[PDB]
Design an enzyme around this catalytic site. Sequence first.
Site, short mmCIF file in Angstrom:
data_model
loop_
_atom_site.label_atom_id
_atom_site.label_comp_id
_atom_site.label_asym_id
_atom_site.label_seq_id
_atom_site.Cartn_x
_atom_site.Cartn_y
_atom_site.Cartn_z
N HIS A 207 -3.62 6.08 3.69
CA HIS A 207 -4.55 4.80 3.47
C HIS A 207 -3.96 3.50 3.82
O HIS A 207 -4.67 2.63 4.40
CB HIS A 207 -4.59 5.13 1.86
CG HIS A 207 -5.43 3.81 1.23
ND1 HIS A 207 -4.73 2.60 0.84
CD2 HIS A 207 -6.87 4.04 0.66
CE1 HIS A 207 -5.67 1.89 0.16
NE2 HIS A 207 -7.07 2.69 0.14
N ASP B 95 0.56 -1.28 -0.17
CA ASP B 95 0.07 -0.08 0.07
C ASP B 95 0.89 1.39 0.19
O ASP B 95 1.91 1.30 -0.66
CB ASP B 95 -0.90 -0.08 1.30
CG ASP B 95 -2.26 0.45 1.03
OD1 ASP B 95 -2.38 1.91 0.87
OD2 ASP B 95 -3.39 0.00 0.85
N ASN C 253 -14.02 0.13 -6.29
CA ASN C 253 -15.39 0.77 -6.10
C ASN C 253 -16.01 1.38 -7.36
O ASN C 253 -16.43 2.73 -7.33
CB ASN C 253 -14.48 1.97 -5.16
CG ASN C 253 -14.01 1.48 -4.11
OD1 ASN C 253 -14.46 0.48 -3.51
ND2 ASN C 253 -12.86 2.25 -3.69
N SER D 56 -11.44 -1.04 -0.43
CA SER D 56 -10.10 -1.06 0.32
C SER D 56 -10.35 -1.41 1.89
O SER D 56 -9.36 -1.75 2.46
CB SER D 56 -9.45 0.28 0.30
OG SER D 56 -8.77 0.62 -1.16
#
Length: 279
Positions: free
Chosen positions: A69, A39, A161, A224
């Site tokens: 994130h 990530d 998404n 996520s």
Amino acid sequence: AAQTNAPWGLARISSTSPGTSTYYYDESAGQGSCVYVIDTGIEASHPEFEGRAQMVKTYYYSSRDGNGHGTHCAGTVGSRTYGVAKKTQLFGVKVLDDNGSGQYSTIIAGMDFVASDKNNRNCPKGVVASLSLGGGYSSSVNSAAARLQSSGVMVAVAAGNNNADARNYSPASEPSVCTVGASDRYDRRSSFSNYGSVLDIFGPGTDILSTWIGGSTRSISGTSMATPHVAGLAAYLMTLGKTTAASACRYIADTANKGDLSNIPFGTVNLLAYNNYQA
Ligand SMILES: [Eu+2]
Ligand SMILES: [Eu+2]
């Protein structure tokens, strides 16, 4: 063990029905397992990680999470207050820049890195990789995710998404990994979640409270956020000896809450991750 007033997603994965607020879990809590979070990095100094997190690789100038994130996802895997597997070891691999973007060649390199690096680590209960990222279809990205799984790592990836069929997104569309959709606290499919036959499982993804950079916390939404719930659940189940890295996704699907979700299109599984805890 029981955590009162837990974030809703933790409570949901230990209950057969929505609306509860206690997270019930076995005290072993993923100890002896390892989870790689691939990530933007992890703020390993955050007090919520208790010294159990470290950065092991970066593809940019620094190993710092300048975005947040990656720290949020890592917190859902294994932070003390916000995590599924509260005693797991967390390893950060920074393949995304501080704006949250990255090239496919760098993402592929990070997966190949984990397949090798795990041989240098003491993870007697097994190894998981959590990938809260993706983009348009690429056979090379799918192949890298398949290699990582074949090497003996349980790979969990976000469905995406786009409110669309996940077959057009990677690594979501690789069949051999564990592709994770998102649900909300009322047991609806999250309005943004991708769907389709390639999904394996759903986890909580709307309004998820977790760790953030600067020693803080914040609530955000996405597939996520659902992905680390499933990655942490796999680590927890491997520590208990219920499953292995090769079969964990199938075991999670076989033991899931079935038929509880609404707004699921025909052809998509109606399965919500569940820890089956009994005191
Ligand atoms: Eu039910
Ligand atoms: Eu699959």
